[PDB]
Write a protein that binds this DNA or RNA. Sequence first.
RNA 1: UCCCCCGUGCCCAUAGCGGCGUGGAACCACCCGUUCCCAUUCCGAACACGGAAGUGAAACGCGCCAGCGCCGAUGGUACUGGGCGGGCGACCGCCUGGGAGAGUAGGUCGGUGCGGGGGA
RNA 2: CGAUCAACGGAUAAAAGUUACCCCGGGGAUAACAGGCUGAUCUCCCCCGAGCGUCCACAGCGGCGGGGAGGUUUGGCACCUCGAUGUCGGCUCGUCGCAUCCUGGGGCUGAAGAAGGUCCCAAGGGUUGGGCUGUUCGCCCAUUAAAGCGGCACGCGAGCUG
RNA 3: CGCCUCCUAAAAGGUAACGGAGGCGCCCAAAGGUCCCCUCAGGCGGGACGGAAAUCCGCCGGAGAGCGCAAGGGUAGAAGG
RNA 4: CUGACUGGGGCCUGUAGAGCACUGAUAGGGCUAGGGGGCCCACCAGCCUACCAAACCCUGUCAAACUCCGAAGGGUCCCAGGUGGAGCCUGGGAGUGAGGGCGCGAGCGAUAACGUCCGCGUCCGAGCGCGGGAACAACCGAGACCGCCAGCUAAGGCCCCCAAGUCUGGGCUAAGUGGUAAAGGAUGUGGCGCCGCGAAGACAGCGGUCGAGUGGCGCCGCGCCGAAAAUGAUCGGGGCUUAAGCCCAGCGCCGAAGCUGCGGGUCUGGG
Lengths: 110, 59, 69, 186, 76, 141
Amino acid sequence: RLTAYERRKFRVRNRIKRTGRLRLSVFRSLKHIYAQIIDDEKGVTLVSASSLALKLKGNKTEVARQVGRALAEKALALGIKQVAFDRGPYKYHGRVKALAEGAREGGLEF
Amino acid sequence: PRLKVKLVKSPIGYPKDQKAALKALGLRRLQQERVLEDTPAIRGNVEKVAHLVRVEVVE
Amino acid sequence: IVISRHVAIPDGELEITAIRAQGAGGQHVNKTSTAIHLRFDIRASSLPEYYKERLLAASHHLISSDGVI
Amino acid sequence: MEYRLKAYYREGEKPSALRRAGKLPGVMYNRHLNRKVYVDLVEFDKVFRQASIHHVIVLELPDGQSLPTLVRQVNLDKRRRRPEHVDFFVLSDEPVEMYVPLRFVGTPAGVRAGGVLQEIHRDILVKVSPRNIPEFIEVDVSGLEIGDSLHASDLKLPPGVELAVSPEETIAAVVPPEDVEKLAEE
Amino acid sequence: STRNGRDSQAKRLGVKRYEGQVVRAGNILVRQRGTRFKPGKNVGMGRDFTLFALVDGVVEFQDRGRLGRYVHVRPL
Amino acid sequence: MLMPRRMKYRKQQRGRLKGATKGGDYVAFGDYGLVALEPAWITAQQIEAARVAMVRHFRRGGKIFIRIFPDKPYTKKPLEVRMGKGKGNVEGYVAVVKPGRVMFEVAGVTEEQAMEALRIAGHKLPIKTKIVRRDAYDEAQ
RNA sequence: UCCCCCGUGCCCAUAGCGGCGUGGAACCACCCGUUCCCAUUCCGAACACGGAAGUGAAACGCGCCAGCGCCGAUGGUACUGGGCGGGCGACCGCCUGGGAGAGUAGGUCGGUGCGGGGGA
RNA sequence: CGAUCAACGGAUAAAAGUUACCCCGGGGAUAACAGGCUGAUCUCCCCCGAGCGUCCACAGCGGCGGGGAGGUUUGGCACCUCGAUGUCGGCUCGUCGCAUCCUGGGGCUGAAGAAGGUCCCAAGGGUUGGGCUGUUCGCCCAUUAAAGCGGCACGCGAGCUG
RNA sequence: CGCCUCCUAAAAGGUAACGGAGGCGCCCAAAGGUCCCCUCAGGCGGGACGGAAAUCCGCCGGAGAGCGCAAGGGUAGAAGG
RNA sequence: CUGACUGGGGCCUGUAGAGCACUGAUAGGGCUAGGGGGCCCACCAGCCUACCAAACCCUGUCAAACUCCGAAGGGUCCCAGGUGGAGCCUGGGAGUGAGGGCGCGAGCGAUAACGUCCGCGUCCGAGCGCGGGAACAACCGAGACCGCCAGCUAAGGCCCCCAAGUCUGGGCUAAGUGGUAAAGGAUGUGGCGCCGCGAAGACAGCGGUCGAGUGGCGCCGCGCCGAAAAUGAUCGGGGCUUAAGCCCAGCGCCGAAGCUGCGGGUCUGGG
Ligand SMILES: [Mg+2]
Ligand SMILES: [Mg+2]
Ligand SMILES: [Mg+2]
Ligand SMILES: [Mg+2]
Ligand SMILES: [Mg+2]
Ligand SMILES: [Mg+2]
Ligand SMILES: [Mg+2]
Ligand SMILES: [Mg+2]
Ligand SMILES: [Mg+2]
Ligand SMILES: [Mg+2]
Ligand SMILES: [Mg+2]
Ligand SMILES: [Mg+2]
Ligand SMILES: [Mg+2]
Ligand SMILES: [Mg+2]
Ligand SMILES: [Mg+2]
Ligand SMILES: [Mg+2]
Ligand SMILES: [Mg+2]
Ligand SMILES: [Mg+2]
Ligand SMILES: [Mg+2]
Ligand SMILES: [Mg+2]
Ligand SMILES: [Mg+2]
Ligand SMILES: [Mg+2]
Ligand SMILES: [Mg+2]
Ligand SMILES: [Mg+2]
Ligand SMILES: [Mg+2]
Ligand SMILES: [Mg+2]
Ligand SMILES: [Mg+2]
Ligand SMILES: [Mg+2]
Ligand SMILES: [Mg+2]
Ligand SMILES: [Mg+2]
Ligand SMILES: [Mg+2]
Ligand SMILES: [Mg+2]
Ligand SMILES: [Mg+2]
Ligand SMILES: [Mg+2]
Ligand SMILES: [Mg+2]
Ligand SMILES: [Mg+2]
Ligand SMILES: [Mg+2]
Ligand SMILES: [Mg+2]
Ligand SMILES: [Mg+2]
Ligand SMILES: [Mg+2]
Ligand SMILES: [Mg+2]
Ligand SMILES: [Mg+2]
Ligand SMILES: [Mg+2]
Ligand SMILES: [Mg+2]
Ligand SMILES: [Mg+2]
Ligand SMILES: [Mg+2]
Ligand SMILES: [Mg+2]
Ligand SMILES: [Mg+2]
Ligand SMILES: [Mg+2]
Ligand SMILES: [Mg+2]
Ligand SMILES: [Mg+2]
Ligand SMILES: [Mg+2]
Ligand SMILES: [Mg+2]
Ligand SMILES: [Mg+2]
Ligand SMILES: [Mg+2]
Ligand SMILES: [Mg+2]
Ligand SMILES: [Mg+2]
Ligand SMILES: [Mg+2]
Ligand SMILES: [Mg+2]
Ligand SMILES: [Mg+2]
Ligand SMILES: [Mg+2]
Ligand SMILES: [Mg+2]
Ligand SMILES: [Mg+2]
Ligand SMILES: [Mg+2]
Ligand SMILES: [Mg+2]
Ligand SMILES: [Mg+2]
Ligand SMILES: [Mg+2]
Ligand SMILES: [Mg+2]
Ligand SMILES: [Mg+2]
Ligand SMILES: [Mg+2]
Ligand SMILES: [Mg+2]
Ligand SMILES: [Mg+2]
Ligand SMILES: [Mg+2]
Ligand SMILES: [Mg+2]
Ligand SMILES: [Mg+2]
Ligand SMILES: [Mg+2]
Ligand SMILES: [Mg+2]
Ligand SMILES: [Mg+2]
Ligand SMILES: [Mg+2]
Ligand SMILES: [Mg+2]
Ligand SMILES: [Mg+2]
Ligand SMILES: [Mg+2]
Ligand SMILES: [Mg+2]
Ligand SMILES: [Mg+2]
Ligand SMILES: [Mg+2]
Ligand SMILES: [Mg+2]
Ligand SMILES: [Mg+2]
Ligand SMILES: [Mg+2]
Ligand SMILES: [Mg+2]
Ligand SMILES: [Mg+2]
Ligand SMILES: [Mg+2]
Ligand SMILES: [Mg+2]
Ligand SMILES: [Mg+2]
Ligand SMILES: [Mg+2]
Ligand SMILES: [Mg+2]
Ligand SMILES: [Mg+2]
Ligand SMILES: [Mg+2]
Ligand SMILES: [Mg+2]
Ligand SMILES: [Mg+2]
Ligand SMILES: [Mg+2]
Ligand SMILES: [Mg+2]
Ligand SMILES: [Mg+2]
Ligand SMILES: [Mg+2]
Ligand SMILES: [Mg+2]
Ligand SMILES: [Mg+2]
Ligand SMILES: [Mg+2]
Ligand SMILES: [Mg+2]
Ligand SMILES: [Mg+2]
Ligand SMILES: [Mg+2]
Ligand SMILES: [Mg+2]
Ligand SMILES: [Mg+2]
Ligand SMILES: [Mg+2]
Ligand SMILES: [Mg+2]
Ligand SMILES: [Mg+2]
Ligand SMILES: [Mg+2]
Ligand SMILES: [Mg+2]
Ligand SMILES: [Mg+2]
Ligand SMILES: [Mg+2]
Ligand SMILES: [Mg+2]
Ligand SMILES: [Mg+2]
Ligand SMILES: [Mg+2]
Ligand SMILES: [Mg+2]
Ligand SMILES: [Mg+2]
Ligand SMILES: [Mg+2]
Ligand SMILES: [Mg+2]
Ligand SMILES: [Mg+2]
Ligand SMILES: [Mg+2]
Ligand SMILES: [Mg+2]
Ligand SMILES: [Mg+2]
Ligand SMILES: [Mg+2]
Ligand SMILES: [Mg+2]
Ligand SMILES: [Mg+2]
Ligand SMILES: [Mg+2]
Ligand SMILES: [Mg+2]
Ligand SMILES: [Mg+2]
Ligand SMILES: [Mg+2]
Ligand SMILES: [Mg+2]
Ligand SMILES: [Mg+2]
Ligand SMILES: [Mg+2]
Ligand SMILES: [Mg+2]
Ligand SMILES: [Mg+2]
Ligand SMILES: [Mg+2]
Ligand SMILES: [Mg+2]
Ligand SMILES: [Mg+2]
Ligand SMILES: [Mg+2]
Ligand SMILES: [Mg+2]
Ligand SMILES: [Mg+2]
Ligand SMILES: [Mg+2]
Ligand SMILES: [Mg+2]
Ligand SMILES: [Mg+2]
Ligand SMILES: [Mg+2]
Ligand SMILES: [Mg+2]
Ligand SMILES: [Mg+2]
Ligand SMILES: [Mg+2]
Ligand SMILES: [Mg+2]
Ligand SMILES: [Mg+2]
Ligand SMILES: [Mg+2]
Ligand SMILES: [Mg+2]
Ligand SMILES: [Mg+2]
Ligand SMILES: [Mg+2]
Ligand SMILES: [Mg+2]
Ligand SMILES: [Mg+2]
Ligand SMILES: [Mg+2]
Ligand SMILES: [Mg+2]
Ligand SMILES: [Mg+2]
Ligand SMILES: [Mg+2]
Ligand SMILES: [Mg+2]
Ligand SMILES: [Mg+2]
Ligand SMILES: [Mg+2]
Ligand SMILES: [Mg+2]
Ligand SMILES: [Mg+2]
Ligand SMILES: [Mg+2]
Ligand SMILES: [Mg+2]
Ligand SMILES: [Mg+2]
Ligand SMILES: [Mg+2]
Ligand SMILES: [Mg+2]
Ligand SMILES: [Mg+2]
Ligand SMILES: [Mg+2]
């Protein structure tokens, strides 16, 4: 049996991988918020960023725009370009959205 | 090696594909003997018609 | 076989001759028909013997003198 | 008795051939072993009819090796109704699941009423060690009557010899007879 | 005395390019009713479930088990 | 007097009888049995004629098991009609029996009584039959 | 390179179900709130935001057990491409090449890629 | 946009019957007769032995079922014959089969005798005259040793009838 | 008498009979596009009228529900609400 | 050079078989709703059932329009072999669009038809040309350019009709079986198996005497009955009996318009 959570998960991630951009996937825990650019043809994570990792800060949301802007900076340097925003099972919102807007400023294309 | 394949029994009344085999082998008359490279392809056709042929090994 | 309303009648002591067709319809009536049935039920065989006796003394066509039906 | 049967390893031999010669072909195996064998037909048979899958057969192989075994399955030929091929299971020390016969002791009062005893298992599945192979397991069918039944939950048992089957399984029953007055109705 | 006797024009369904076959963008690779094959990489599905090559390349069939079977076109 | 009480389909095509029986080859209920030597359709009115005869041989008996049952519909066009204009009407049902199947068994009765009851029952069947005892092989299946 | 945990994929039940059993430093959950963003055909249950008393109860992770489930040989058979014989039939055989399904032995309480936080 | 053009690739915008008063071109590509193949149907014969026969399965019978033979019935097929193979029934003339109606020989009998029943062997010979109907068939009269059943293109119309 | 589904059909496709079975000659302004959320039948226990079945609560439950309509194929990682 | 046909390799597939997990069918037993009946009892429930019986379970099965499973084969693409009255392309001219038998797979029919309808294949058609099958379009053998008073074979044959063995070794059969049939019945006869009762002397005869074997089953071979049809009989005929029959195993021969030898003709390709 699957949970509404496990489905919504699949339901979005499916549609996403269908368009075949790089996957920017976002986990958001109660304490922290994490992000990875993934190429799921090669099965490999390319560029990574988080709150727990960059050790900050923080207001839960404002932490995000940072870990967002964080990822782009790094990312862009390794050559991306563009990418598809995986919203996981999470209403596109902030912290989740507040990332994103974070990545978008840093130059990530989407 | 080589295969020496002699056609000893008539294909009349046998299926067209076995007739075709006999052609890919190159045997057109009764009693005719042909000396044939032994590859897998040749052997396949030699086996397909095996009930019309007498085979023996050579060269 | 032969499916009379209460008892029996058994399982083949009855005689059905196929004879030729009287009247209309050509060589086929002259020839392949036939297709007509005479029958013989000879009154003493099987039967309750109450049918046999109420059957034997009755005055009817279809029921012969020696009859035989 | 402890039943002994000769037996011989075969390799390329076509079973058609063996079979033709009077040799019923078979395999033997367990967790550590698998080997292609045959026995003699008429000889194998001598045993099996008294033996079956109930009692231990001991195969005496030409290498002198002699292994204790239970018959697992006989593959019959449906047309002839003759054994085609035999599975020999080599017992070792462990316990093993297997089939233990039933003596149904005593005459049911379901019979003697005019009824009939339907033995719905002539034997019973059981986990048990090969030291423990009971020559059989008895059951009192005397208190059984027309309509009545016996479930293996109420089966007696030795030590041990744990059942392997739902004790809800049904080992015996006493059914009413075939009858002619039944005819006219039906 | 028959209520029967009908039947319908037959539909020529099934895979139209097998694995290893070279296609061209646009090729129909499967004709099907519902989804007997899911479109994999570079293969699209049309409103009737027909699958077709999105690019020129080589067919590959994939069996993902529980997930179903897929048809991919490996580009060249 | 044996037929399905319901069918998915009313009439069905004839098919062949190749081979020996899918199974049904070993005894499995009673003590003694009747096995089929030849393939055939067995008509319910035969299967029942066969049953009945044994029950009568027992007069008040053991058990009679019936291991084949007539689920195939038997069709016939009425008499004198020509070819076509549909498929005929179901006039009976048969059981399909390929060789080696055990059709009847008996239990609860003496060896001499099964040897008879199964023999007489045999004659009502339209094929060759063997009488059998329980073996060890029937017990090991 | 090794152990742990968090994310993602791949295999596609040997990965499931059901019993026990363990973990809270970390991570994760549950948890404290409902001002604010955002929400309920009613409900802060869910979604969502601001937190950090507490607890691993629930869930999740890691372990053990074979009751079910799942997998499953070897051998033999059925069936058969091709070649041949038998019968009035239904049908029955042989040769050569392929060869199941069920059943038995057994197996299984997952394995693995990339990336991160920690630990040795 | 206007089609039950639904006989749905849709002859006209517009259309039903009868012919024993009938005609032509064709077909044994196709029916009615006969034959043939088949043998479901029919006729005969066997298997089994429930069960009748006071008693007793089997003198005589034979539930439910099973196997066959014949090619006389009705059919199924559509194979020669549609540049013709005249159709029922009668008469005349026969000849053959035997699954025998009589006559000859036998076994069993629920065969005292006399008569019967049933089966077996037997085709040499025989197998009547009338009333009714076109009839074959059948019913009926009077007899009889008996008043047999089939085959021959349901024998026989370059032999007759009609 | 056209169209669709299944079988016959001999594991590509196609395949006949006055062979076995059924449907169509409509429909939907939402039954359409997209974004977002949600998950069934069924079973056992619980509960005013309340029953076999109205609505409510729990536990079990891969899909046997649903998908306007016949059948088939597909399908909850949705095509269903 | 691509063709049929074949080798290897990949994908596609749901038949034969098998299975029962789905849809249905389904015998018996278990467990157990609900009916029915007997007991009470109208105080409203309780017991027994050898009755009918849902769900579920166990044993045992069935299915074109069932499938948890599933071959052999088939289809297609690639690479290779394949030079063939192969192949592709553009044109000119057709005829055919009544098929038929046999095999195998099915439907219809009656597990009938020289029956119908499809599928794969073959032959006849057009090979009624040749050898075998007594005779006989399609069964067996074989694809006939012409000539030979030469040779080797095929199927089938080798007692005489009638070319070649009254050939060799083993066995069966006594019916002329061979030389048209079924259920069924039987001290026909022969070969392998299984037990019983036998000097504890049934085993048949009229617990005694006889002195040796007997009695009931299995798997197989060949025969017997079952077996009636209409002009005259018959295996093609004569005739055949340790075969001129049947089974097994050899050797030699005969036998076509097949193949060879020799001569010739024409087409085609090449020197
Ligand atoms: Mg030939
Ligand atoms: Mg051939
Ligand atoms: Mg081919
Ligand atoms: Mg070749
Ligand atoms: Mg009768
Ligand atoms: Mg008149
Ligand atoms: Mg008139
Ligand atoms: Mg008229
Ligand atoms: Mg034996
Ligand atoms: Mg009962
Ligand atoms: Mg209709
Ligand atoms: Mg049709
Ligand atoms: Mg179709
Ligand atoms: Mg069609
Ligand atoms: Mg294409
Ligand atoms: Mg689309
Ligand atoms: Mg692959
Ligand atoms: Mg029948
Ligand atoms: Mg019937
Ligand atoms: Mg019989
Ligand atoms: Mg058992
Ligand atoms: Mg079984
Ligand atoms: Mg991967
Ligand atoms: Mg699975
Ligand atoms: Mg995992
Ligand atoms: Mg704990
Ligand atoms: Mg903590
Ligand atoms: Mg703590
Ligand atoms: Mg939550
Ligand atoms: Mg816990
Ligand atoms: Mg989690
Ligand atoms: Mg287990
Ligand atoms: Mg298995
Ligand atoms: Mg094998
Ligand atoms: Mg084969
Ligand atoms: Mg075969
Ligand atoms: Mg083939
Ligand atoms: Mg074959
Ligand atoms: Mg024959
Ligand atoms: Mg075979
Ligand atoms: Mg083989
Ligand atoms: Mg092999
Ligand atoms: Mg195998
Ligand atoms: Mg297997
Ligand atoms: Mg196991
Ligand atoms: Mg383990
Ligand atoms: Mg497990
Ligand atoms: Mg993982
Ligand atoms: Mg580290
Ligand atoms: Mg119009
Ligand atoms: Mg109209
Ligand atoms: Mg209509
Ligand atoms: Mg028209
Ligand atoms: Mg019109
Ligand atoms: Mg038309
Ligand atoms: Mg059209
Ligand atoms: Mg017009
Ligand atoms: Mg007019
Ligand atoms: Mg006229
Ligand atoms: Mg007039
Ligand atoms: Mg008129
Ligand atoms: Mg006039
Ligand atoms: Mg006129
Ligand atoms: Mg005219
Ligand atoms: Mg016509
Ligand atoms: Mg005539
Ligand atoms: Mg006629
Ligand atoms: Mg004629
Ligand atoms: Mg006949
Ligand atoms: Mg007879
Ligand atoms: Mg008497
Ligand atoms: Mg009496
Ligand atoms: Mg009768
Ligand atoms: Mg019959
Ligand atoms: Mg009959
Ligand atoms: Mg007949
Ligand atoms: Mg005739
Ligand atoms: Mg006729
Ligand atoms: Mg004609
Ligand atoms: Mg015709
Ligand atoms: Mg004419
Ligand atoms: Mg003329
Ligand atoms: Mg004339
Ligand atoms: Mg004239
Ligand atoms: Mg007169
Ligand atoms: Mg006579
Ligand atoms: Mg008579
Ligand atoms: Mg006399
Ligand atoms: Mg005298
Ligand atoms: Mg007498
Ligand atoms: Mg008396
Ligand atoms: Mg007298
Ligand atoms: Mg006479
Ligand atoms: Mg005479
Ligand atoms: Mg006379
Ligand atoms: Mg007279
Ligand atoms: Mg007169
Ligand atoms: Mg007068
Ligand atoms: Mg008059
Ligand atoms: Mg009259
Ligand atoms: Mg007369
Ligand atoms: Mg006469
Ligand atoms: Mg006539
Ligand atoms: Mg006449
Ligand atoms: Mg006459
Ligand atoms: Mg006349
Ligand atoms: Mg004349
Ligand atoms: Mg006049
Ligand atoms: Mg197909
Ligand atoms: Mg096919
Ligand atoms: Mg819709
Ligand atoms: Mg519910
Ligand atoms: Mg409730
Ligand atoms: Mg309450
Ligand atoms: Mg209430
Ligand atoms: Mg309620
Ligand atoms: Mg609920
Ligand atoms: Mg559904
Ligand atoms: Mg289907
Ligand atoms: Mg929706
Ligand atoms: Mg080439
Ligand atoms: Mg090619
Ligand atoms: Mg190939
Ligand atoms: Mg499948
Ligand atoms: Mg099958
Ligand atoms: Mg089932
Ligand atoms: Mg089972
Ligand atoms: Mg169902
Ligand atoms: Mg039941
Ligand atoms: Mg099917
Ligand atoms: Mg089929
Ligand atoms: Mg099927
Ligand atoms: Mg499998
Ligand atoms: Mg395959
Ligand atoms: Mg292609
Ligand atoms: Mg291939
Ligand atoms: Mg090439
Ligand atoms: Mg042109
Ligand atoms: Mg042209
Ligand atoms: Mg011209
Ligand atoms: Mg033309
Ligand atoms: Mg045709
Ligand atoms: Mg043709
Ligand atoms: Mg043909
Ligand atoms: Mg054959
Ligand atoms: Mg038939
Ligand atoms: Mg035919
Ligand atoms: Mg024909
Ligand atoms: Mg012509
Ligand atoms: Mg010829
Ligand atoms: Mg030709
Ligand atoms: Mg001629
Ligand atoms: Mg000839
Ligand atoms: Mg000839
Ligand atoms: Mg002919
Ligand atoms: Mg030529
Ligand atoms: Mg010579
Ligand atoms: Mg020869
Ligand atoms: Mg000879
Ligand atoms: Mg000579
Ligand atoms: Mg001699
Ligand atoms: Mg000799
Ligand atoms: Mg005689
Ligand atoms: Mg003779
Ligand atoms: Mg004779
Ligand atoms: Mg016989
Ligand atoms: Mg017999
Ligand atoms: Mg003897
Ligand atoms: Mg004998
Ligand atoms: Mg012996
Ligand atoms: Mg003695
Ligand atoms: Mg005879
Ligand atoms: Mg006679
Ligand atoms: Mg010889
Ligand atoms: Mg020549
Ligand atoms: Mg020359
Ligand atoms: Mg030329
Ligand atoms: Mg030149």
